[PDB]
Antibody
Framework: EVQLVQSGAEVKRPGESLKISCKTS????????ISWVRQMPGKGLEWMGA????????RYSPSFQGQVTISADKSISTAYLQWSSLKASDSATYYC????????????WGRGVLVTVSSASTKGPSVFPLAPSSSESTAALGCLVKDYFPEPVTVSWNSGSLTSGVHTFPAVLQSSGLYSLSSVVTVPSSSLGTQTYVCNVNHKPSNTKVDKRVE | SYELTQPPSVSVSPGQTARITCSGD??????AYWFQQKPGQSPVLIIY???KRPSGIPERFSGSSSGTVATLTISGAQVEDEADYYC???????????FGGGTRLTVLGQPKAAPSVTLFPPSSEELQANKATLVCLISDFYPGAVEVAWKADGSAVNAGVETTKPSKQSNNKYAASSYLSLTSDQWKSHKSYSCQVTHEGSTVEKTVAPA
């Protein structure tokens, strides 16, 4: 079977260089063009360019020509896409694809590689309690998980012993480049005074976990 | 340059026929291709060479190209057909690939559901750091599209709002959140703030007041 194996996820800063790879097997590497396609978060697919490994011929979309370089190494059946100086807007999932017989037809796709380009530094979240203003049979409590980078964050309540009625929301990406999310749970007001409620917020990228008591 | 133009969104009820169009100057001379993309997955080829179906693609998908418009037709749409659909072709020379902007196909198949909205005031801990983040949490809405606006004492809030796109919940309804980032002084300068969530032509507003 045709297989395309792409390099792993990258987190880079604007102005840094980057080279990502696509190693193929199961067919004659130099007999087919390889296309590169990208997808910015929440946006559409974009054809970037293609290379013919038989003669190093390259074609580029006018939107990418001269700003990225596609290359190939037939000795290891690998295609590459590289930048000398990334832009922040280059955050995207990048796919390689073996072409079909017709020029620019797309035959077999790689699984894609996630590339994050951000000026934000790795930062654990500041966790703030969410409570209503001081009616009475239940109560909504929560935690604001503020200003962290990068993804992901996981949240539990009372070390995972409280799951019923928990709603943890996906993060917003702020213009600063930092993320924030919230988690909320509805609890009985009878328990408010005998039951403690703690949100456990884990941010492995910064090796930080916060257990915030919510009163 | 050259472009392929698609409608951003199409809605269909289950069992109905959906038609997704793709407009391009060179389509009278070039083949169109159709890709289906579901979240966290690579695109899947649905139609190639205007009208051909690959092995294993459901019979209900068909393609055609008339004039400058290629159409993907989904007869008797199913909920599992909910996805983004991209047309793909080349420029007139044939040397460069091009995608349409994509169409989000919504297959309804559950009743409309109004959002539940919870608005939290800032914590005292954040206020003691001279900051105030208002948190507007929105859940259990269907279909998955909302608009969020903020008001302060009835006046528009023109900056500081960050709102997520909707995300599918396990029950197949949708959730979103919106954040208004203020200073402590701004929070205390108004009598109230409101989060306004508009869904299917109607609005729910939640209000908080410095206490």
């Amino acid at each position: 079977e045709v297989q395309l194996v792409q390099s792993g996820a990258e987190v880079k800063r604007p102005g840094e260089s980057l080279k990502i790879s696509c190693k193929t097997s199961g067919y004659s590497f130099t007999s087919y063009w390889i296309s590169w396609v990208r997808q910015m978060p929440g946006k559409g697919l974009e054809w970037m360019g293609a290379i013919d490994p038989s003669d190093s011929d390259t074609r580029y979309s006018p939107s990418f020509q001269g700003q990225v370089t596609i290359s190939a190494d037939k000795s290891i059946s690998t295609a590459y896409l590289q930048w000398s100086s990334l832009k922040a807007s280059d955050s995207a999932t990048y796919y390689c694809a073996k072409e079909g017989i017709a020029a620019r037809s797309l035959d077999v796709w790689g699984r894609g590689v996630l590339v994050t380009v951000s000026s934000a530094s790795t930062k654990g979240p500041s966790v703030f309690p969410l409570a209503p203003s001081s009616s009475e049979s239940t109560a909504a409590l929560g935690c604001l998980v503020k200003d962290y980078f990068p993804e992901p964050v996981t949240v539990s309540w009372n070390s995972g012993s409280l799951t019923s009625g928990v709603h943890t929301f996906p993060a917003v990406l702020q213009s600063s480049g930092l993320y924030s999310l919230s988690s909320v749970v509805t609890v009985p007001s009878s328990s408010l005074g005998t039951q403690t409620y703690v949100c456990n917020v884990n941010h492995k990228p910064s090796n930080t976990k916060v257990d915030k008591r919510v009163e | 340059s050259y472009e392929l133009t698609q409608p951003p969104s199409v809605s269909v009820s289950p069992g109905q026929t959906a038609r997704i169009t793709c407009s391009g100057d060179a389509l009278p001379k070039k083949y169109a291709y159709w890709f289906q993309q579901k979240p966290g997955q690579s695109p899947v080829l649905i139609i190639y060479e205007d009208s051909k179906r690959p092995s294993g693609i459901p019979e209900r998908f068909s393609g055609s190209s008339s004039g400058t418009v290629a159409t993907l037709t989904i007869s008797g749409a199913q909920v599992e057909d909910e996805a983004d659909y991209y047309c793909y072709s080349t420029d007139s020379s044939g040397y460069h690939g091009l995608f349409g902007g994509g169409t989000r196909l919504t297959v309804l198949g559950q009743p409309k559901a109004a959002p539940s909205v919870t608005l939290f005031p800032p914590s005292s801990e954040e206020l003691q750091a001279n900051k105030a983040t208002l948190v507007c949490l929105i859940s259990d809405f269907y279909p998955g599209a909302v608009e969020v606006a903020w008001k302060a004492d009835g006046s528009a809030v023109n900056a500081g709002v960050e709102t997520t796109k909707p995300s599918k919940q396990s029950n197949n309804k949708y959730a979103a959140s919106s954040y208004l980032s203020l200073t402590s002084d701004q929070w205390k300068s108004h009598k109230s703030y409101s989060c306004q969530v508009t869904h299917e032509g109607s609005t729910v507003e939640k209000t908080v007041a410095p206490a």
